[PDB]
């Protein structure tokens, strides 16, 4: 009965890497297969997400264009499912005494929460690990960006994303990734087609990798503990919390 927390974990988070989604199977006709290079161009720029759940568009196959990105895109989901993401939380925000509790009160976990900025580093060296270079265009893209998110974590505002902020002085030409021409002038009809593109990535990244990060292995709560603050407990602490809430008001 472990089909449980991949359920409620897709509707409601804070249950683990199980289901976030580059960890999802694509659904095939006779049951589900790891997801590929190509089916995370599919969830990104075409379909998205429902992709996985048997959506389809045409074209069915890749334009030049996009079918170029495979091999980066293939590249990613190698270095995810190469990433060590208790490491980087251990290395981050780390567990205190969750698997040693023994007989700790409910107290004792309490103040064990994550500032927004230690979420930040964890997610920050997610997109180290994960996230080909070369995707990022340039050090300049990459570094605006990582700073895009630290105000983005820090707001706590996870539903007034702006993609007009997120791309702001983004140099959408350091991605020769988009490009399937580097001979000639660039008319504004190919610019504007290659920052539509960067958008979906971009967005995607916020709004799928990072956001579906937090999700999965944080629950933030609105607490505790006055008002108003937001916390985000690791969702190891948080199971615990509510496990020992639980046990005392339940003989």
């Known amino acids: 009965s472990q089909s449980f927390m991949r359920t409620l974990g897709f509707l409601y988070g804070g249950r683990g890497m199980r289901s976030f989604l580059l960890n999802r199977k694509k659904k095939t006709a006779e049951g589900f297969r790891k997801i590929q290079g190509r089916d995370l161009i599919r969830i990104v720029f075409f379909e998205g997400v429902l992709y996985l759940n048997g959506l389809e568009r045409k074209p069915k196959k890749l334009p030049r264009r996009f079918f170029n990105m495979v091999p980066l895109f293939s590249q990613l989901l190698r270095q995810h499912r190469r990433c060590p993401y208790s490491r980087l939380l251990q290395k981050t925000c780390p567990l205190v005494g969750i698997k040693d509790a ?18 930040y580093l964890f997610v920050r060296e997610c997109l180290l690990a994960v996230i080909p270079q070369e995707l990022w265009g340039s050090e300049h893209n990459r570094l605006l960006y990582f700073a895009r ?31 399937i021409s580097k001979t000639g002038r660039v008319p504004p009809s190919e610019l504007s087609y290659r920052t539509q593109i960067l958008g979906q990535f971009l967005a995607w990244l916020l709004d799928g990798f990072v956001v579906g990060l937090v999700r999965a292995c944080f629950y933030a709560t609105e607490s505790m503990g006055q008002k108003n603050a937001i916390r985000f407990y690791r969702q190891e602490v948080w199971a615990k919390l509510q496990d020992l809430a639980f046990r005392s008001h339940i003989s």
């Open 149 to 179: 998110v630290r105000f983005f974590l820090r707001s706590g505002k996870f539903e007034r994303l702006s993609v007009a902020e997120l791309m702001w002085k983004i140099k959408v030409n350091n991605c020769d990734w988009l490009k």
């Open 102 to 119: 023994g007989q700790a009160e409910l107290s004792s976990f309490l103040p064990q929460h994550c500032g927004s900025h230690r979420v």
